Design an enzyme around this catalytic site. Structure first.
Site, PDB file in Angstrom:
ATOM      1  CG  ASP A   1      -1.820   1.184   1.298  1.00  0.00           C
ATOM      2  OD1 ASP A   1      -1.940   1.894   0.281  1.00  0.00           O
ATOM      3  OD2 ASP A   1      -2.428   1.407   2.377  1.00  0.00           O
TER       4      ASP A   1
ATOM      5  CB  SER B   1      -2.227  14.252 -13.514  1.00  0.00           C
ATOM      6  OG  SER B   1      -2.634  14.003 -14.849  1.00  0.00           O
TER       7      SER B   1
END
Length: 330
Positions: free
Chosen positions: A35, A199
């Site tokens: 994770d 992004s």
């Protein structure tokens, strides 16, 4: 040193991925959920409340000659999905794919919430976010990666998750055969303890690319792609009959649909998520309403590039003095 381990979807939907991890002496192999959005290595154990164990493999520290109680240390964690666990702490030898760390904090669960109990395939979590998020008290502990880093050939790990197929976690090296083209690196903020990056935009299907900054985290422990409501609405508007359902808890779409791809930007590069990656199947057995793999982050407080996005790429988690993230197509 290096390590290399195969990671395997837990079910036919890729709801999560499990990677075998050797703990203790002699080794006890547990299948852990790696994770990159958390920083605790915790396991089902001989200390876990018996009624909360249902099929998991447990770590038994009393059977490990290298286990030592970390005196006075406790831990307690709550995840974004509302699940939680807590317990006490041992140090022991932990190996992943041939890479060994001695003195790793292994957090032994005394209690786990229902969603963990109900998932027989996940024996615990191995956190790969920054150690500043580790919950051990009163002395915070380091992640497996943080402990291994100085010994690694290069201070990196990579995630290469499969779509409905096994993939690989590598530590200490970049497998140049595992991706196509070049790796595009992008800046990371560690201020919130995550692999947080921005992004450069998105496209839906064959549509034009929208240049827009989307801050979010690269999180292997989250199944879906969670993005701003504007972006998510633009995606689902291209699927006839798709709608946001408050009763189901997100966007659903007719199972008869053909889903468009979704592209996200990494600098000037582009990662394409095929439409099929966005299908999470019937909302309940036999239903013709299917659950979407792109969902709104509104009310989470952060955008999450979870497995839906990451499995479309070869992803480099660069833990150099100034961390960065790399993405390549594959």
């Amino acid at each position: 040193s290096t390590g290399s381990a195969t990671t395997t979807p837990i079910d036919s939907l890729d709801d999560a991925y499990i990677t075998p991890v050797q703990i203790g002496t002699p080794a006890q192999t547990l299948n852990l959920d790696f994770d990159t959005g958390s920083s605790d290595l915790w396991v089902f154990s001989s200390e876990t409340t018996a009624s909360e164990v249902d099929g998991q493999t447990i770590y038994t520290p009393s059977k490990s000659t290298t286990a030592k109680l970390l005196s006075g240390a406790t831990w307690s964690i709550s995840y974004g999905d509302g699940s939680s666990s807590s317990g006490d702490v041992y140090t022991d030898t932990v190996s992943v794919g041939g890479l060994t760390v001695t003195g790793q904090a292994v957090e032994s669960a005394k209690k786990v919430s229902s969603s963990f109990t109900e998932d027989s395939t996940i024996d615990g979590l191995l956190g790969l976010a920054f150690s500043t998020l580790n919950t051990v008290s009163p002395t915070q502990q380091k992640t497996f990666f943080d402990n291994a880093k100085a010994s690694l050939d290069s201070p990196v790990f990579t995630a290469d998750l499969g779509y409905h197929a096994p993939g690989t976690y590598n530590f200490g090296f970049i497998d140049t055969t595992a991706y196509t083209g070049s790796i595009t690196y992008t800046a990371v903020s560690t201020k919130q303890g995550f692999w947080e990056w921005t992004s450069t935009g998105y496209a839906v299907g064959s549509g034009t690319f929208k240049s827009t900054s989307i801050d979010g985290i690269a999180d292997t422990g989250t199944t879906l792609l969670y993005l701003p409501a504007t972006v998510v609405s633009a995606y689902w508007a291209q699927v006839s009959g798709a709608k946001s359902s408050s009763s189901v808890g997100g966007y659903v779409f007719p199972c008869s649909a053909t889903l468009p791809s979704f592209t996200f930007g990494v600098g000037s590069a582009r990662i394409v998520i095929p439409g099929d990656y966005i299908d999470f199947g019937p909302i309940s057995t036999g239903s013709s309403s299917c659950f979407g793999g792109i969902q709104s982050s509104a009310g989470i407080g952060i955008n999450i590039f979870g497995d839906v996005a990451l499995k479309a790429a070869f992803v480099v988690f660069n833990g150099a003095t100034t961390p960065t993230l790399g993405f390549a197509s594959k």
